[PDB]
Ligand binder design. Structure first.
Ligand SMILES: NCC(=O)NS(=O)(=O)OC[C@H]1O[C@@H](n2cnc3c(N)ncnc32)[C@H](O)[C@@H]1O
Length: 441
């Protein structure tokens, strides 16, 4: 089967052969978008093109975009290690039409790449599609132009409980380009738990969302209103890791060549032997987001972007502790990461030493309180009555030991214990009030 690197290249070669300009991945950190925490989609760097505010010399493009979904609109941090399909850091394979072609050709390009004997040659019978319930045009295209049996074409409405809140209406953020979308799913087989999209068991890892094709139609305003974009356009994204899993005949993203090698490296540096422990997968995921974020300019801090980075690093270090790592380990995974990323790791390779030192320093800093804080948490959990850690304790772990509340919640979750988030926030607010009273005007 093809390597992850070969799949990345083949995707780009396909679209290039179809006249799409190959454009380099943007950074994970925007310089000119105040609404965006980290790059969460291939379309981010083309936002102004979709808005009609910018025009490129090309009207169609293709990229393999590094994305982090660990905050803001699209945040999958709490899914990591609990599913076979979710990462913080991942590559999104995309094609884009800037007032060029539209619905039919977008769908045809995707179906051709996926199912043609000349291309990925996926078994057509294992592919399912969803359309936005009101998108009769997309439904007809799949049914009559492509020829998907009706039983595998699923209509999805506003299933997220609000207008335009839907798995089939994609939004860049609370504001920005958005529109109805159609998604392609692959059935990994009945040996995996789960049902098809729209079903009660849709959330299982059996039927995996591979490729989202967005028909960009609106610019969402903060008040929730939808202003039409000047030219209906196309924004698509396919998870490189998810399509690699399909192509490499495995079911989990973590079983692709890239992650198998990386997970072996995690075992080596932590001293773990059971290659099935979920902490190995969590750490393998986390080094990707942490290392690339630092390469793209983020420094650990207690505010904004720096704090999200700090939170992920510390959670990774905590998982290393659970695995029994005896010495500083996280920075040692940068080399191994560079080795599996191919050309997509060039920005990280360029700054290897710098990224390693930032990670080493952060882990060493956290180690000043990690074990002591875990000791306290164990003490408090041992005498805890009920299923919920009190907010005062969570806040003490935060204030004294530098445990982000989500790190505390992560440890507790592994023991089926919840954290009183409201209580934590009340304690934080009480401290804010003390700070105000003491500081004065
Ligand atoms: N602009 C259009 C769009 O963004 N669409 S989409 O939000 O759906 O993401 C595009 C795709 O990237 C993959 N993907 C998304 N999130 C993750 C994640 N946390 N981990 C791994 N793969 C993911 C997934 O295969 C998916 O269909």
């Amino acid at each position: 089967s093809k390597s992850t690197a070969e799949i990345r290249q083949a995707f780009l070669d396909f679209f290039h052969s179809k006249g799409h300009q190959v454009v380099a991945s943007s950074s994970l950190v925007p310089h000119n978008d105040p609404t965006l925490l980290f790059t969460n989609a291939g379309m981010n760097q083309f936002k102004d093109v979709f808005l009609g505010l910018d025009k490129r010399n090309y009207s169609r493009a293709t990229t393999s975009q590094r994305c982090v979904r660990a905050g803001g609109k699209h945040n999958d941090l709490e899914n990591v290690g609990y599913t076979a399909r979710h990462h913080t850091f991942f590559e999104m394979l995309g094609n884009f039409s800037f007032g060029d072609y539209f619905k039919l050709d977008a769908i045809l390009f995707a179906w051709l790449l996926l199912t043609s004997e000349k291309w990925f040659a996926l078994p057509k019978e294992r592919l399912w599609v969803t359309v936005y319930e009101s998108d009769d045009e997309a439904y007809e295209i799949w049914e009559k132009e492509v020829g998907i049996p009706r039983e595998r074409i699923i209509r999805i409405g506003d299933n997220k409980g609000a207008p335009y809140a839907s798995d089939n209406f994609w939004q860049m953020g609370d504001t920005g380009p958005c529109g109805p979308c159609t998604e392609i799913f692959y059935d990994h087989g009945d040996h995996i738990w789960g049902g098809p999209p729209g079903s009660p068991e849709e959330d299982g890892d059996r039927y995996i969302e591979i490729w989202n094709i967005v028909f960009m139609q609106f610019n969402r305003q903060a008040d929730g209103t939808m202003e039409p974009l000047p030219k209906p356009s196309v924004d698509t994204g396919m998870g490189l890791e998810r399509i690699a899993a399909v192509l490499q005949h495995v079911n989990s993203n973590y079983d692709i060549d890239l992650f198998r090698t990386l997970i072996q490296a995690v075992a080596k540096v932590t001293g773990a032997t059971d290659l099935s422990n979920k902490s190995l997968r969590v750490i393998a995921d986390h080094i990707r987001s942490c290392a690339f974020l630092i390469a793209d300019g983020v420094m650990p801090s207690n505010e904004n972007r720096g704090y999200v980075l700090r939170r992920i690093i510390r959670r990774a270090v905590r998982h290393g502790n659970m695995l029994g790592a005896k010495e500083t380990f996280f920075y040692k995974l940068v080399g191994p990461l560079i080795d599996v990323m191919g050309s997509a790791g060039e920005d990280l390779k360029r700054q290897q030493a710098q990224v390693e030192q930032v990670l080493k320093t952060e882990e060493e800093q956290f180690a000043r309180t990690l074990e002591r804080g875990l000791a306290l948490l164990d003490e408090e959990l041992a005498k805890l009555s009920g299923d919920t850690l009190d907010g005062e304790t969570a806040f003490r772990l935060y204030d004294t030991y530098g445990f982000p509340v989500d790190l505390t919640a992560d440890v507790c979750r592994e023991r089926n214990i919840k954290v009183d988030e409201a209580g934590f926030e009340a304690a934080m607010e009480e401290q804010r009030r003390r700070a105000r009273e003491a500081s004065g005007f």
